[PDB]
Amino acid sequence: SGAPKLQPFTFPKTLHEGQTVKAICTPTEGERPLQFQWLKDGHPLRPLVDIKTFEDYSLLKVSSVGEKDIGNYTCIVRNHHGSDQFTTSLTIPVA
Amino acid sequence: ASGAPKLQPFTFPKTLHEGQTVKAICTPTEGERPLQFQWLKDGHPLMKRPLVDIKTFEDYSLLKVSSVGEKDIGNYTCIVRNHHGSDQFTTSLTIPVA
């Protein structure tokens, strides 16, 4: 008990070029404090991409989404007990 | 209709368990401020409760339901409005059988 478990999240498939898109990384259980780490295609993460982290959730914001942003994004959440993680694909229709 | 708000679609995870925390984010993909956000449950304005918490950011909203119970099962709607238009989504908070 005490280790984090993340709320499942996937990017919607109806996002369109130029829109702002966000991913939320947040536990459904787990002791605090919590550490949040974001990766894109396996590597750590540009003015148009922002990370805002709070006590028990972290928000990745990709503004004016475009070809430069397509890829797989991972959030790893950690506390003193262990970690959880999810990965979700950001793809957009051909405008 | 330039300036009108549009929401990022959001759906609760389909398999929730009693006791967990669950959150819904209501965040705009486009639009001009000022924006106003509201939440409904089963079509009625969402009432404040000790473990039902609406967080207000500068231009988005977050609903946090702690210790999910059968009390919380229902259909939740977020509506965003401004001078130029409105948008909304609805998602069901469900506890399916184990």
Residue numbers in the entry:
A (entry chain B): 0 to 44, 47 to 96
B (entry chain A): -1 to 96
Give sentences copied directly from the paper behind this entry:
Recently, a shortened Dscam (sDscam) gene family with tandemly arrayed 5′ cassettes in Chelicerata species has been identified, which encodes ∼50–100 isoforms. Chelicerata sDscams could be classified into two subfamilies, sDscamα and sDscamβ, containing one and two variable Ig domains, respectively. Crystal structures and cell aggregation assays demonstrated that both α and β subfamilies of sDscam used Ig1 for the isoform-specific trans recognition in a hand-in-hand manner. Furthermore, the cis interactions were established by the three FNIII domains of sDscam, which assemble into a cross fold with a kink between FNIII2 and FNIII3.
We also determined the crystal structures of sDscam Ig1 from another chelicerate species Limulus polyphemus (isoforms α7 and β3v7) to provide insights into the conservation of sDscam trans recognition within Chelicerata. These crystal structures of Ig fragments were determined at 1.3–3.1 Å resolutions. The crystal structures of sDscam Ig1 from both M. martensii and L. polyphemus revealed a common assembly of antiparallel homodimer for both α and β subfamilies of sDscam. In addition, all these Ig1 homodimers resemble each other well with root mean square deviation (RMSD) values of 1.0–1.6 Å, indicating a shared mechanism of sDscam trans recognition within Chelicerata. Similarly, sDscam Ig1 also employs the ABED face to form an antiparallel homodimer. However, among the seven Ig1 structures reported here, the complementary electrostatic potential surface pattern (negative in one end, neutral in the middle, and positive in the other end) has been only observed in the three β isoforms, but not in any one of the four α isoforms. Electrostatic and shape complementarity had been observed in all Ig1 dimer interfaces.
